[model samples]
Target: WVLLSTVAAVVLGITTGVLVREHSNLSTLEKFYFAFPGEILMRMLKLIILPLIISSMITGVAALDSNVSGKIGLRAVVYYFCTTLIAVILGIVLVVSIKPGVTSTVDAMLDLIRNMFPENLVQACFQQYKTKREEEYKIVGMYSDGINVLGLIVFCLVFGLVIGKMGEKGQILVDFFNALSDATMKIVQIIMCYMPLGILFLIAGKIIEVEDWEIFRKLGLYMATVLTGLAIHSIVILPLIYFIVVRKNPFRFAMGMAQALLTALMISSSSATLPVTFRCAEENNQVDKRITRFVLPVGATINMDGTALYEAVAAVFIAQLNDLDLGIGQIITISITATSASIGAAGVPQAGLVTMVIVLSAVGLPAEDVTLIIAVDWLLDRFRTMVNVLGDAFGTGIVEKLSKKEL
Candidate 1:
């Protein structure tokens, strides 16, 4: 229902948007009629992210077996990291070659980079300095982006380890958080039930706001570039990796992945698609429970293969459109910043849009250009989210396969 509605919204909105010389009248209706539900949905998504992160991360980390042999656990981390790195590189390779037209608005990008850093712990001492001069300087520079998600994830890791030492105490806390995670999952379901309606308005409002259908035409190549990279990554690289490492028929694995892929496509959210992704992996691929539990949640939260690649393409896409050139150094910087940005990044729709700022800032592009680049974002986001889930599931399969074998 939501998928169909989302398609209808985009199709009708853009199709009608072409004829909308309606001006302010359409704008008002779009804002009121087509905007509210999406707003509610996005707000609620943000609301649950922290709680969801805390619950899922603690459980995921605390449950890890510290003394496993064969480096099965260690190998999984290496695989995840390498796959994500390669995904980003592929995104870069395609974007640089296609020069996808490209795409931003920069202070916004810097702020995004700032947000990625752990909280200013060293700055804490400056505020307590003895001199008025130092105190005044510190006061002048004071800033906070409270509840840093990156920092929060690290804190959860540390605490989860601490709790892992508690034995009975650990089980109690883990059980408590597990229940909270379950409850949060239900809330997501409720939020999703309203999503089709929200999607309808959201797409419509965004569409009707466009000044011309020609906008889509102009950006078509850019969209094609990103999608092409995403497609090859999903269709070529992912399946090839699966076959090579797991020694499985990639096509048959995909056939079992239909339900999960469909859900991911419809929602454009890996996090929201986690439950279905898990079910598909366990029910179909027969991945181990330990693998599914430890890996899937972490994947949903952090594995943004599609996202990093998308951002690489997006940065270059915008740079191309702007007629700006990035030097070798800047390109490497793009890769580095994008990798860190992908770490613990949210897996929801348009999450790339938020993280792309760091890349734009790294490359000295305009943050406001994001507004222009996003003209086709709603469409591209869906494709990448599907790839993200596919990559996530297949990587877990590889980990499971290797873990069950001995060297």
Candidate 2:
């Protein structure tokens, strides 16, 4: 029933989007109704996000305070961050070699810059920092400056660790947080009952907004380059890392992760797909429950290898399109920005693009260039989510191997 609804939504969305983009005669009321469902769903998801992250992180950490918990948690985090760094570098190198953006007409690229970056730094900073205030605001700002998502993850980890180590002193707090987390997840499940409708509207709106085949054709190379890099990372690099480091059969691992990977691809959300990934790790891979419980959560939160790669490639592609000659310093800045932004991005739909905007703004690229990527993002988001799930599985496998667990 869920699958059928989701499919219907996608079809309707695509049809409406194409129709709206191609036909100006469509009624404003029709467009509004078409877009309303997805917008509401997105808000529904957003409504649950803050409580979910806080409570879940606290619960996850508290559960990890046992000896096994510390071991698996540490291993998962280390593996996730390390591999993410490598993925970002690989993306930058590959995109630069291909130079997808270089194919754009110079005049168009310049016009993109003139429109995207205003003369005022304060406005740019304000535009980029849209989240509600929190204790982590400084850390998030640090990420905006290219410090990477490591800082935010580190803060979460440390906070989780402290909560875990609180013993009886923290027992009541832990229990409260755990209960809150469970309740929030239940709320999420209920809200997701409307997801099919939401996805339909979201997809439809996107399709309506992007009807220009000519622009798509013009940026074909850029799209191809990003997709190619993402594919290699997902299919080749990640699997090899899993096999070599974990000594697990790559085929078996792939099969085990297939369901979670497919779900992530369709949903474009690592967080939403995480519960399934955790189940798969335990049931399909026969990973230790302790390890699965610890590693998978942390990985979902911080292991954004696919997002890292996308940010790098996208930033460079935009720069090249604009005919802006990026110096070594600028390239290094991009690498840092992409890697960090990937970390800060929530594991949700279109979060990658939002983070991409942050990276572009940091590097003084044209924000409108973001629209160019957005047009093709839905197509690419599926593959990107696949890479994301692969990275999560890879992190799990790596941690499992480090713990000397048999595959």
Candidate 3:
């Protein structure tokens, strides 16, 4: 039902948008009014992001602490990290080579590191550190108008670890964060219920706002870039990685997890797809329950292969749209920032957009360019979720094979 509604919303949005564009004489004010509901939808989604990140990151890390200490758990973590890095590099290589208009790395990285350790936690909530060149040949570092998401993720990692170290005493806090995470997810559910309606108007509003259909051509190229990156990662890269590590039929393993991947496609949220991933890994693929239980949840929360890749491509896509030239240093910054951003990205639809701000800000790009990416994001969201699930599934097999003695 959700998927059907989402498709319907996109189709209707395009239809109404084209009709209004070609036939109507609506004023700018009228267009604003038309898009007001959709504006509220974006606002609502943005509003929930801070709380969602805080609660989810805390609880996820807190939960993973013990399991992560074990060799089996550590093996899974390494696999997750390796696959996600490979995915990001593949995406960057594809976007850069494709010249998807053709699209930086050092103050950017240092500044990203600065944001990762904000001097003031309260300020970090709404501002990140950045370097600006106001006068020619001069650079200045200052706080900017965006959440220091990298800093927050770092804090949560340490905080969750401290909580995990407390053992029985930490149970109360763990329960609190777990409840907080649940409440935030409930809010997300309600927001998503309104999402289809909001998407209808958001798409229409953007369509009405476009002056040049040329942008659509660029966007199509951008979509092609992202889709090609995702296809390569999911179909080629992941399966090949599995074959090399597990020495088994990777395609057959993928087939075993087909239902889970489909659920990821329809659901577009790794966290939401967790149960099906668990079931398929256990019953269909016969992965050990102990490993699946420990690894899958952590994977759903942190192993975001698709998101890292998509964000890297989208950031470059935005940069290309602006005719901005990214140097090797900046490209490396995008890669590092995307990796960190994806780690913090919750397993929810459109969450990557929130993290994209972190990547853009790290590279001194305008966060507003996200508007361009949002139009085609719905489809890309589904594709990334499938890759995220596939990465998790492949990690499970690799971990299981390597840790047979542990089992």
RMSD per prediction, one decimal?
8.1, 9.7, 3.8
Q: What is the lDDT of every predicted structure here?
A: 0.64, 0.64, 0.79
lDDT of 1: 0.64
TM-score of each: 0.59, 0.60, 0.82
Q: How would you encode candidate 1's per-residue C-alpha lDDT over 248-270 as one tens digit per residue?
A: 79889977889988998777778
| TM-score for candidate 1, residues paired by index | 0.59
Give lDDT for model 2. 0.64
In candidate 2, list every pair of residues with a backbone clash: 13-204, 17-207, 17-208, 148-340, 149-340
Q: Which stretches in model 1 have alpha-carbon errors above 4 Å?
A: 1-70, 102-218, 344-352, 405-407
Top model number, lDDT: 3
| Per-residue lDDT value at 259 in model 1 | 92
lDDT of 1 at 224: 79
User: Lowest summed-lDDT stretch of 10 residues in model 2?
Assistant: 139-148
Predicted model with the maximum TM-score: 3
Error of 2 at 306 (Å): 1.9
Model 2 residue-pair collision total: 5
